[PDB]
Paper text:
The PIM (proviral integration site for Moloney murine leukemia virus) family of protein kinases (PKs) includes three constitutively active serine/threonine kinases (PIM-1, PIM-2, and PIM-3) that regulate key biological processes, including cell survival, proliferation, differentiation, and apoptosis. As a basophilic kinase of the CAMK family, PIM kinases recognize basic residues, in particular arginines at positions -3 and -5 of the phosphorylation site, which are required for high affinity interaction. All crystal structures contained one protein molecule in the asymmetric unit, in which the adenosine analogue moiety of the inhibitors was positioned in the ATP-binding site of PIM-1 and the peptide mimetic moiety bound on the surface of the substrate protein site.
The structure of the ARC-1411 complex with PIM-1 revealed a canonical type-1 inhibitor interaction of its pyrrolo-pyrimidine hinge binding moiety, forming the anticipated hydrogen bond of the pyrrolo nitrogen with the backbone carbonyl of the hinge residue E121. Due to the insertion of a proline residue in the hinge of PIM kinases, the pyrimidine moiety did not engage in additional hinge backbone hydrogen bonds. Remarkably, the first arginine moiety connected via an aliphatic linker to the ATP mimetic hinge binding motif engages with the glycine-rich loop (GRL) residue S46. The second arginine in ARC-1411 mimicked the interaction of the arginine in the key substrate position -3, which pointed into an acidic binding pocket lined by the αD residues D128 and D131. The following arginine in ARC-1411 formed polar interactions with D239 that were not present in the substrate complex, most likely increasing the affinity of ARC-1411. However, similar to the substrate residue R-4, the next arginine moiety in ARC-1411 pointed toward the solvent, but the following arginine mimicked again the substrate arginine in position -5, which is required for high-affinity substrate interactions. At this position, the arginine side chains formed an intricate network of polar interactions with residues located in αD (T134), αF (D234), and D170.
Numbering used by the authors: 33 to 305
Write the structure that this text describes.
Amino acid sequence: PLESQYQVGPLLGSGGFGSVYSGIRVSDNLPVAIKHVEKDRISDWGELPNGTRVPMEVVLLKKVSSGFSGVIRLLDWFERPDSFVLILERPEPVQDLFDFITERGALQEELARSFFWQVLEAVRHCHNCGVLHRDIKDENILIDLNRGELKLIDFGSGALLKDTVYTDFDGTRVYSPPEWIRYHRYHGRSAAVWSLGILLYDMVCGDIPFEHDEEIIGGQVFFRQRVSSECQHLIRWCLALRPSDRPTFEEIQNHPWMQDVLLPQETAEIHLH
């Protein structure tokens, strides 16, 4: 019985993803987020062990929601006549990374390193679970301000991970790679690495590097802030024009800029508390 298990609080936001409300699980007072998705707005459908027909978003969340990780966990879901309702983890207190960068500007490299490392671990977890997020960006990352933990949200543009070409894309354009702009084709891993270079630039410069198609395919990155030579190197490597010139996750995590990461608790004590 959905409406009696959850006290519905205020609207947290709405858009392409649906409508998300703050909530409290009535039994144990667990903070949750209650996401409503209209059936007309779901193009991508899948099914579970049961062979019951659900939004792809529910398939992907279940695949990643087992064990602890830097992914928002799906706690429950419900079908209504015109909608699905998803019950998600809600960190408290929380700020999305987009708002955090708006308020604080360009992040110190030590904080960007801690955040970028956690996003890499979260994206490895997705890939290891057979899930491609396809919309990695500051707006889809929550900061747990007391634990210093990042959580990935919004799998509504995601797909099962495959080794063959993708010819569909409904993620954020300006985090989309040049091969999509030019050819309407991409491979999952190398396109994820592009979106990670956009995100790292966003953290160390305070905004995304490209606005127009011509900048995305142009192959020049201009630094608007003071950024270390090792950080510029990693970013320009992630943003290689040719997908096969981009680093693997292993090569990113072994990059000299990535060494000596803070633990989440240290990150919260030094930068967040």
